[PDB]
Write a protein that holds these residues in place. Sequence first.
Motif, short mmCIF file in Angstrom:
data_model
loop_
_atom_site.label_atom_id
_atom_site.label_comp_id
_atom_site.label_asym_id
_atom_site.label_seq_id
_atom_site.Cartn_x
_atom_site.Cartn_y
_atom_site.Cartn_z
N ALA A 96 -4.24 12.90 -15.88
CA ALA A 96 -2.92 12.58 -15.35
C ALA A 96 -2.02 11.90 -16.39
O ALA A 96 -2.50 11.20 -17.28
N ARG A 97 -0.72 12.11 -16.26
CA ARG A 97 0.23 11.48 -17.17
C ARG A 97 1.43 10.88 -16.42
O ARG A 97 1.99 11.50 -15.52
N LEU A 98 1.80 9.66 -16.80
CA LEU A 98 2.99 9.02 -16.27
C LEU A 98 3.84 8.52 -17.43
O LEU A 98 3.36 7.80 -18.30
N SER A 99 5.11 8.91 -17.44
CA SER A 99 5.99 8.55 -18.55
C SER A 99 7.45 8.46 -18.13
O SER A 99 7.85 9.03 -17.10
N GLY A 100 8.23 7.75 -18.93
CA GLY A 100 9.65 7.63 -18.67
C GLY A 100 10.38 6.82 -19.72
O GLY A 100 9.76 6.09 -20.50
N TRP A 101 11.70 6.96 -19.76
CA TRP A 101 12.54 6.07 -20.54
C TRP A 101 13.75 5.68 -19.72
O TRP A 101 14.19 6.42 -18.84
N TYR A 102 14.29 4.51 -20.02
CA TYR A 102 15.54 4.07 -19.44
C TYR A 102 16.41 3.55 -20.57
O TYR A 102 15.91 3.17 -21.63
N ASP A 103 17.72 3.52 -20.34
CA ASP A 103 18.61 3.05 -21.38
C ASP A 103 19.27 1.75 -20.90
O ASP A 103 20.06 1.75 -19.95
N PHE A 104 18.91 0.66 -21.58
CA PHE A 104 19.51 -0.67 -21.40
C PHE A 104 21.01 -0.60 -21.71
O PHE A 104 21.78 -0.09 -20.89
N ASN A 105 21.45 -1.11 -22.86
CA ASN A 105 22.79 -0.80 -23.34
C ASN A 105 22.69 0.56 -24.01
O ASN A 105 21.61 0.95 -24.42
N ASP A 106 23.79 1.30 -24.08
CA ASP A 106 23.72 2.67 -24.57
C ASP A 106 23.44 2.74 -26.08
O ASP A 106 23.58 3.80 -26.69
N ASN A 107 23.04 1.61 -26.66
CA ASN A 107 22.51 1.58 -28.02
C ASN A 107 20.99 1.39 -28.01
O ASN A 107 20.31 1.72 -28.98
N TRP A 108 20.46 0.83 -26.92
CA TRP A 108 19.02 0.56 -26.81
C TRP A 108 18.35 1.36 -25.70
O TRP A 108 18.88 1.49 -24.60
N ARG A 109 17.17 1.89 -25.99
CA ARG A 109 16.38 2.61 -25.01
C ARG A 109 14.91 2.20 -25.09
O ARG A 109 14.36 2.07 -26.18
N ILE A 110 14.29 1.99 -23.94
CA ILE A 110 12.87 1.65 -23.89
C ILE A 110 12.10 2.75 -23.18
O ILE A 110 12.54 3.25 -22.14
N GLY A 111 10.97 3.14 -23.75
CA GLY A 111 10.15 4.20 -23.18
C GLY A 111 8.71 3.76 -22.94
O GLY A 111 8.16 2.96 -23.69
N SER A 112 8.12 4.30 -21.89
CA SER A 112 6.75 3.97 -21.51
C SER A 112 5.96 5.25 -21.25
O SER A 112 6.55 6.28 -20.91
N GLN A 113 4.64 5.20 -21.42
CA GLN A 113 3.83 6.39 -21.22
C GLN A 113 2.35 6.09 -20.99
O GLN A 113 1.67 5.53 -21.86
N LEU A 114 1.86 6.47 -19.81
CA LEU A 114 0.44 6.36 -19.46
C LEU A 114 -0.23 7.72 -19.42
O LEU A 114 0.34 8.67 -18.88
N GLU A 115 -1.43 7.82 -19.97
CA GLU A 115 -2.14 9.10 -19.97
C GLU A 115 -3.64 8.99 -19.70
O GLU A 115 -4.32 8.08 -20.18
#
Length: 290
Positions: free
Chosen positions: A90-109
């Motif tokens: 199984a895989r779980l992943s995503g990104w969100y954008d804080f300010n439109d200069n910064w983005r944080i991404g996460s990913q479980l596998e």
Amino acid sequence: DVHNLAELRIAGSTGIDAEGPDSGKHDVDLTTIVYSPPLKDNWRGFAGFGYADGGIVRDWLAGVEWRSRNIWLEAEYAERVFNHEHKPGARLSGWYDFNDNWRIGSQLERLSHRVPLRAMKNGVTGNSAQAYVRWYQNERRKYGVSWAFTDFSDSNQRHEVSLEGQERIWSSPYLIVDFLPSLYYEQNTEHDTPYYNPIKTFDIVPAFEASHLLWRSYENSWEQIFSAGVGASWQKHYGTDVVTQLGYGQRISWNDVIDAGATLRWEKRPYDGDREHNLYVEFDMTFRFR
């Protein structure tokens, strides 16, 4: 005008002569995935297939994707088969954008691809967790911090860290040149292993990439990609030698319905002493349709 339809993605990797430690001279990686249309405005479901022979490993997968801007998210479950032996994934992943200069991404596998794809010759299973942060300081300047922890089914835990940069050196109507300096850190624990498990590796590879435009008319185009890098690789109990890498590829974009690219890659870095060379071809195609 229709531009959000069903999407077919097909991507593949094959070794011409890979004398490296965690790949035979000739390996074959193929993954094909089809996305449904926007089931509703943000939701898409996908099913796919994965293939790897080098004793053949196949993947059957299915998952869902949610998508607004400022935040993208998908989950995915797969079934992996090898030698009449089924194991879950199984895989779980995503990104969100804080300010439109910064983005944080996460990913479980589970199982993780960050495990060399056949340490499983002895059935080595792995689960992992990735995270990254990306920061856009100018409009011509971009830095990426990333790291990943991986737990192997043989007590080995791999903590990888990477730091990339993307600086635009030259931007022409026909030619762009990026400076892409990369740093990488990898640490493991298990010492006598049947797979390449370096205890502590650190690389500094300054590299550039140049996209040249061969032809374009309006919304469809054709470009060639040249990339080159010269750096150094350090490995404890082995010291340091030189890293060199070259790539040549081309891209085709057609009516926002066809995207295709193929790259020929070469790299020569030290593994447990002196340098071996890897030569391989990558490709990817995306289509949009019924």
